[PDB]
Amino acid sequence: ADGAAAETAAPGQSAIENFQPVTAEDLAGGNAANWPILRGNYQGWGYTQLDQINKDNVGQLQLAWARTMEPGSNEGSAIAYNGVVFLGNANDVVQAIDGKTGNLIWEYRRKLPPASKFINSLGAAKRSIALFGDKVYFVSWDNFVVALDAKTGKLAWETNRGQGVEEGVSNSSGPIVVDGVVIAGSTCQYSGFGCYVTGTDAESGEELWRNTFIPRPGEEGDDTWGGAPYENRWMTGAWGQITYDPELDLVYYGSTGAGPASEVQRGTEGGTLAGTNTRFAVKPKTGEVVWKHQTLPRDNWDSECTFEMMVVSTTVNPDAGADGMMSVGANVPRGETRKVLTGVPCKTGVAWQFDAETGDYFWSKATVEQNSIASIDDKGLVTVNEDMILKEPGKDYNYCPTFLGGRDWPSAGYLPKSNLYVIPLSNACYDLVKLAPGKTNMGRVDAIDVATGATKWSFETEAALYDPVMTTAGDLVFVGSTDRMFRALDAETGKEVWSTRLPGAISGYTTSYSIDGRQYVAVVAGGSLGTGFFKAAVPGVDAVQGGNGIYVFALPE
Numbered sequence: 001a002d003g004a005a006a007e008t009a010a011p012g013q014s015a016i017e018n019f020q021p022v023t024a025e026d027l028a029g030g031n032a033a034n035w036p037i038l039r040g041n042y043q044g045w046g047y048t049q050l051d052q053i054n055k056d057n058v059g060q061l062q063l064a065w066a067r068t069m070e071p072g073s074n075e076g077s078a079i080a081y082n083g084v085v086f087l088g089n090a091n092d093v094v095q096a097i098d099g100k101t102g103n104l105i106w107e108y109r110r111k112l113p114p115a116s117k118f119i120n121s122l123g124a125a126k127r128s129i130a131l132f133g134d135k136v137y138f139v140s141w142d143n144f145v146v147a148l149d150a151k152t153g154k155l156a157w158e159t160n161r162g163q164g165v166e167e168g169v170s171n172s173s174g175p176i177v178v179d180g181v182v183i184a185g186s187t188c189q190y191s192g193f194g195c196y197v198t199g200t201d202a203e204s205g206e207e208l209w210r211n212t213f214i215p216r217p218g219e220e221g222d223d224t225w226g227g228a229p230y231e232n233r234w235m236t237g238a239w240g241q242i243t244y245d246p247e248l249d250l251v252y253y254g255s256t257g258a259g260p261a262s263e264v265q266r267g268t269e270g271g272t273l274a275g276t277n278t279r280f281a282v283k284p285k286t287g288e289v290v291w292k293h294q295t296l297p298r299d300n301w302d303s304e305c306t307f308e309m310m311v312v313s314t315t316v317n318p319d320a321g322a323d324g325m326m327s328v329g330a331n332v333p334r335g336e337t338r339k340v341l342t343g344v345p346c347k348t349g350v351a352w353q354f355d356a357e358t359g360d361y362f363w364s365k366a367t368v369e370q371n372s373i374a375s376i377d378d379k380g381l382v383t384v385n386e387d388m389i390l391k392e393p394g395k396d397y398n399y400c401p402t403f404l405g406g407r408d409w410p411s412a413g414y415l416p417k418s419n420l421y422v423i424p425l426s427n428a429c430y431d432l433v434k435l436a437p438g439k440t441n442m443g444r445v446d447a448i449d450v451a452t453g454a455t456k457w458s459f460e461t462e463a464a465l466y467d468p469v470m471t472t473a474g475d476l477v478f479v480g481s482t483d484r485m486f487r488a489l490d491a492e493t494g495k496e497v498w499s500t501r502l503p504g505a506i507s508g509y510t511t512s513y514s515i516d517g518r519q520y521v522a523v524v525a526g527g528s529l530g531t532g533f534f535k536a537a538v539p540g541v542d543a544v545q546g547g548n549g550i551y552v553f554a555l556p557e
């Protein structure tokens, strides 16, 4: 009762009352109350500075609100900004929801062709939308870059990148926006060609640049494809998460492998496949490549070196004797502070550290059991294990990890107070699925000292996790599992300090935001491609898909 009339905000058909344009400072992490990009900041940390919820009170966390989401693979993220959650659902449904109450504000529903016409169903999942200025940005299953008005959800512009639906190019991770350029990778997992990263003007929709990865006869690296004709080089894309450093003004992404996985079937025997499984640092306005490094050459294992890599500042002091250390860079600047690009880029589970500005190699370290990499030298040159390349049809090829890792898309998090990189992993191997030798627990989270490479703790549990982490200033790590358990761990020890259990597998991202001084922890759940993948190895756990939704927790008031 305000005036004598009933003022209403009809759910799904309303506007945000007060929307303030999103700035580069917001996206660099400038307002701890918000989570305006997939990993909280451009630099990829997956961290919240909010500490209302901490190791002493997290045991009291209760369900504040939840809301049903579209059916399908539910890998998305609650992108939170000034009291509104912007939520990419499966099937190109995008919602704005009041972050305090759970009331739907607006809902955009894309009109799509029937699912049967898409040769690449991976684009039906949507790990994130992006924010910039006055618009919400996403890449559609049919391969358009799309901008919606943030206040109302109405379509602003859409740009068809080409080759979606029947030709198989799509996007599953979502774009980021840097200084007015929407940057988006692609998946072309089922296509007889490679794909790209594009930059598109955020206000006009004009494509500004497009980077591809497969060299052509005449270009540097063509001689590393084993003589395979250019038209037999397939599936190399960049489907993972994009990060960015504002000060260096460098965008970071990784390309993937070539398809099929067997080099004999591809006709690339002996080829290291320049352009594949390469970490690029590029300028956002033009796509110009500044530096690059191939983290998995001659891939025969669908290793997909496209996952997020973090920009952090650390003392550089790798311990050559740390568990899993592969090598230390020849002239590492020991004892100095550097801005580094660091993390695990590929399913194989090997963590890498480079100078963020120059690409100089500092170190690499294995986590899970792996046998595709025989060694890495002091310049970061990887030598693969010839005995894991399929040659004779009758031999046993016991590869570690698997096509789901190791790691896969589920993201790591960073704890700046302890300088720890925290990564969710799977202790799996398979016949080129089973538990890796000596492991009884499929699910694993490792916490690695970014300065030394030493593993400080490891949490393990029977069920596969296959879900991102979120790190917090409250000394907590949140992580979900295939058997529906949503946990908080003590960030100092890895020990479980709280849990709940949701209707389905915890399959999407965890984010955190504050409204009126109250901290909320939002997780997307229901199921993904991974939920049922570990069943042969872990039959005893109640891993089930269903109940797709956003679920938001907070402390009692």
Ligand SMILES: O=C(O)c1cc(C(=O)O)c2c(n1)C(=O)C(=O)c1cc(C(=O)O)[nH]c1-2
Pocket: 073, 075, 122, 123, 125, 171, 172, 173, 186, 187, 188, 189, 235, 237, 239, 256, 302, 304, 403, 404, 408, 409, 528, 529, 530
């Ligand atoms: O090669 C590719 O284009 C592409 C795309 C995707 C996708 O976009 O989600 C995955 C993979 N590859 C892949 O190799 C993989 O293991 C995988 C797991 C998932 C998932 O949703 O859980 N997506 C994908």
Ligand SMILES: [Ca+2]
Pocket: 156, 157
């Ligand atoms: Ca317009």
Ligand SMILES: [Ca+2]
Pocket: 292, 293, 294, 359, 361, 379, 380
């Ligand atoms: Ca290099």
Ligand SMILES: [Ca+2]
Pocket: 189, 256, 302, 304
């Ligand atoms: Ca793949």
Ligand SMILES: [Cl-]
Pocket: 149, 155, 156, 157
């Ligand atoms: Cl508009």
Ligand SMILES: [Cl-]
Pocket: 155, 156, 157
């Ligand atoms: Cl318009």
Ligand code: NA
Pocket: 133, 134, 135, 203
């Ligand atoms: Na605008």
